[PDB]
Amino acid sequence: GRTTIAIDPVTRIEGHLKAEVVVENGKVVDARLSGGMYRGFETILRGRDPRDASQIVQRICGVCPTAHSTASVLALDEAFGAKVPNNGRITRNLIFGANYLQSHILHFYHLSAQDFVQGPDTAPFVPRFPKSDLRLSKELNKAGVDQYIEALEVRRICHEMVALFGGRMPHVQGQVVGGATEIPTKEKLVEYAARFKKVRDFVEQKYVPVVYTIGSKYKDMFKVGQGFKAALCVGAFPLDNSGKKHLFMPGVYAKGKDMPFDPSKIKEYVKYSWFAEETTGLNYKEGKTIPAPDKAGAYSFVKAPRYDGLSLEVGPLARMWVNNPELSPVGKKLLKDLFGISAKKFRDLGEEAAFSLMGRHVARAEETYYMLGAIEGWLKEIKAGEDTVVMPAVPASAEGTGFTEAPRGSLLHYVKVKDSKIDNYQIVSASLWNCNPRDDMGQRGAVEEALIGIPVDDIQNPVNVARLIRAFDPXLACAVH
Amino acid sequence: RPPVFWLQGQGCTGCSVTLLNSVHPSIADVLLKVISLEFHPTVMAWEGEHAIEHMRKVAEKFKGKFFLVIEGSVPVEADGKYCIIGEANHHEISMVDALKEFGPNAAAVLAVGTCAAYGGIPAAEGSETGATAVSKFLGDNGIKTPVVNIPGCPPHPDWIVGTVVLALDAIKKNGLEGGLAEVVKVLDSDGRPTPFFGRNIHENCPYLDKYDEGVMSATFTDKVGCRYDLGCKGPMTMADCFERKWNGGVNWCVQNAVCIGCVEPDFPDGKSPFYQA
Ligand code: SF4
Ligand code: SF4
Ligand code: FCO
Ligand SMILES: [Cl-]
Ligand SMILES: [Fe+2]
Ligand SMILES: [Kr]
Ligand SMILES: [Kr]
Ligand SMILES: [Kr]
Ligand SMILES: [Kr]
Ligand SMILES: [Kr]
Ligand SMILES: [Kr]
Ligand SMILES: [Kr]
Ligand SMILES: [Kr]
Ligand SMILES: [Kr]
Ligand SMILES: [Kr]
Ligand SMILES: [Kr]
Ligand code: NI
Ligand SMILES: [S]
């Protein structure tokens, strides 16, 4: 029969999320995701010196502020007509990249891993579900724990890598319109490289291994969470000063079918979100944000984005799928050793397994390796002492748009200037693509979809409802702003 | 180890993240040897109505002995709908509802971040949520629970960890309401502990000479001059960042670009524009 479970708050995510599932036959058959907290940076930002945006918009999210600083300056760059010094471009990628590493380590170890690992006997790691489904050996579980404790210092270090050229973290001071505010010295490029090597080693040696190690005990989890099996990437970490080659190149994948990315095919629906009916369906350049907290039928503060009517998903999997890069070394081994599988590029994981609860966790562990390579490649490219910033003039009237990939997926800021002050600012952020409610056609958000068919053998212990959600790395602050 | 509840409202999860960067003690030592963290929606194992129930239990167990941490401001408008935190017994809980339930029965209340302490960004010019600072919310609902503000956007881990200790040690020495009186005594007028916010940035800036010479930087990357013309707000900010610096000491805001006075009650509106004198 049909029993309704409600999980509010979903813990070990970032932000306020309620998930609602209805269960018949021991499987999820309908879901509803609610974003329960709203601030409205999209109106707060109106009227300000455009250069304030590069600080305000980081306070959207405390985990991924450099993705916001980055999206923001990119837009301002366009709107001001600024030319970012080549050596500034790299410095920016070094500030942002170091937090991808920090974000992804943070997610697995400190947010997800407890899905699969019993921490110690001290709060907050108990009290927890009696029938939790923690299948690791006393040994593997004590190894799971030892590393969590270790990630506490690895991720703390990544924030010192960020802070060397960004100034601080969370909330960098270093990224501005025109580039980066501090030129890398030889001295500090060592400081960064020293720490980078400690991190390089942990990711290669501990994090990537243990995701497969744990994964192979939970092989049933690659069979659920497929959702619409559609992915989005919009490009990130520019490699040239022209805007052509990027670390992640853009692209869409929907219905076995690859296509190009067209930002003008973006519209945000609000039928089921607490925003004024008269704003639904617009594109970011014409956006408005009018909260309607008493609207009947709405059930989330997160808008409902669709790309040409599609409900897509974003993030590591979505990025690693579109680009299909060559799999890491440590990953090709343990796929052979533990899964008995042979793959050399990403898509050799196939649509079903890649697009699975445990396939996204892995994309995120594989994408991190990919970043070890990007950062090592930039520490060669950076040249100490060469100028990073230009000091542009505020346009009276201008418009710009910044596209990038936050750790959790596609992010963009759009800005409209008037009389030299912000007249409109709009944000389409990663967790907005995953955690959104239904659109106006009743089409479910990508995660709402992913939840269908999830095993809830144990209505008392619906631990998998929350395991699926966590695999997406949600930030409901980034979703709502 | 005394029991701690960590409740987020209109926060960006920044307060929590900066605390994970506490070096000595590392966050792990804080959690296992200093405090019993009983509820924190971001790090804790259990979830949902279970996760709330465990809190009300501990809250009812240790009435007058649990410590209540608030990150983010409290949006009172729309009956509290702009910030729902949970559901238990099929009724949904606003931050307003929660701060009422638990605020009164706490040893003390730690408002962390500039959002919680002073209201900050969700309370700024252009907001329509009625975002309210903790201390103001409580008084306006009759609650007399002591409140300690540890502001910042985000606060430096040491300002937090620092504040917890000097209150437990104020409680060890003199018992509870005795320590709490000592704790309230080391506060300036803005509810901040003077150990951390008792000195001004400017008055201790190492570029103060460049300030007095009138040599200013024209581009950010020019680390020679004073930053006032680029928009540094050190002159009107009260914080010890010049000493301890950020992220294990690897940089800080004036050295890197500018100070935006994130610790001050008027942040952000009173400190904007950030990048003009
Ligand atoms: S204006 Fe800023 S850089 Fe100049 S002396 Fe004051 S705190 Fe230092
Ligand atoms: S120096 Fe100023 S802007 Fe930087 S952390 Fe301290 S109070 Fe905030
Ligand atoms: N990563 C991150 Fe934040 C989210 N989701 C953004 O963009
Ligand atoms: Cl980020
Ligand atoms: Fe938006
Ligand atoms: Kr953590
Ligand atoms: Kr764990
Ligand atoms: Kr783990
Ligand atoms: Kr290897
Ligand atoms: Kr924490
Ligand atoms: Kr966190
Ligand atoms: Kr811990
Ligand atoms: Kr933690
Ligand atoms: Kr206190
Ligand atoms: Kr603490
Ligand atoms: Kr405390
Ligand atoms: Ni975020
Ligand atoms: S995030």
- The domain limits of chain B are 1-196, 197-277
Q: B193 forms bridges with which residues in the sheet? A: B187
φ, ψ for residue B81, nearest 5 deg:
-65, -25
What is the C-alpha end-to-end distance of chain A, expressed in Å? 38
Which domain does A289 fall in, by range?
A: 2-472
Whether the link from the prior residue into B273 is cis, omega within 30° of 0, is: yes
Phi, psi of B8 (to 5 degrees): -90, 140
Separation between Cα atoms, residue B151 and residue B163, nearest integer Å: 11
Q: Which residues contact B80 (CB under 8 A, 6 or more apart)?
A: B94, B95, B96, B97
- A167 phi and psi, to 5 degrees? 110, -55
Return the structure tokens found at B236: 């009107």
Q: Please indicate, yes or no, if residue A481 is contained in any of the structural domains.
A: no
Pocket of ligand 16 (CB under 6 A): B 67, 164, 167-168
A104 found inside a domain? yes
H/E stretch holding A402 reads: strand A399-406
Q: How far apart are the first and last CA of chain B?
A: 47
Q: Which two tokens stand for residue B50?
A: 């279970």
Q: To 10 degrees, what angle do helices A208-217 and A138-166 make? A: 150
Q: What is the CA radius of gyration of chain A?
A: 22
CA of A64 to the centre of ligand 4 (A): 3
Annotated binding-site residue? A42: yes
Report yes or no on A431 lying in a domain.
yes
- Number of domains observed in the structure of chain A: 1
Residue type for position A410: S
> In degrees rounded to 5, what are phi and psi of residue A48?
-95, 155
Tokens describing residue B138: 């409580």
Beta carbons of A48 and B272 less than 8 angstroms apart: yes
Which residue of chain A comes nearest to B126, CA vs CA?
A44
Beta strands B67-71 and B108-112 are: parallel
d(CA A445, CA A449): 6
The answer to the question of residue A478 being in a domain is no
Ramachandran quadrant class, B175 (left: phi over 0; alpha: psi -120 to 50; beta: rest): left
Contact residues, chain B, for A168 at CB < 8 Å: 246-247, 251-253, 256
Beta bridge partners of A246: A238
Total count of residues recorded for chain B: 277
Is A8 within 8 Å of B92 when comparing Cβ atoms? yes
In a domain, A477, yes or no: no
> Resolution of this PDB entry, in A?
2.2
Residue A176 lies in a domain: yes
Going by C-alpha positions, the residue among A407, A229, A405 that lies closest to residue A321 is: A229
- Give the residue from A167, A153, A214, A152 showing the smallest Cα distance to A65: A167
If you take atom 1 of ligand 10, which residue's CA is the nearest one? B16
Distance B11 CA to ligand 17 centre (A): 12
| B21 in contact with ligand 11, CB cutoff 6 A | no
A268 is in an annotated binding site: yes
Question: Do the Cβ atoms of B87 and A8 come within 8 Å?
Answer: yes
- B101: exposed, middle or buried (Cβ count in 10 Å: 0-12, 13-18, 19+): middle
Calculate Rg over the CA atoms of chain B: 19
In this structure, the number of other CB atoms found within 10 A of the CB of residue A349 comes to 25
Centroid of ligand 7 to alpha carbon of B127 (angstroms) = 39
List of chain B residues whose C-beta atoms are within 8 Å of the C-beta of residue A62: 11-18, 154
Contact B47 A9 (CB under 8 A): yes
Which class for B100: exposed (0-12), middle (13-18), buried (19 or more C-beta within 10 A)? Answer: middle
Q: Which residues of B are catalytic?
A: 12, 15, 115, 153, 202, 205, 226, 232, 241, 253, 259, 262
The SS3 call for residue B173 is: helix
Q: Alpha helices of A324-462 — where are they, by DSSP H?
A: 329-334, 350-354, 357-381, 430-434, 446-450
Q: Could you give the maximum distance between any two Cα atoms of chain B, in Å?
A: 66
Helix axes A186-202, A357-381, angle to 10 degrees: 150
In a domain, A479, yes or no: no
Is A158 annotated as a binding-site member?
no
Answer whether residue A191 is part of any domain: yes
Q: How far is CA A125 from CA A384, B30, B116, B149, B225, in A?
A: 45, 14, 26, 28, 50
CATH of the domain at A392: 1.10.645.10
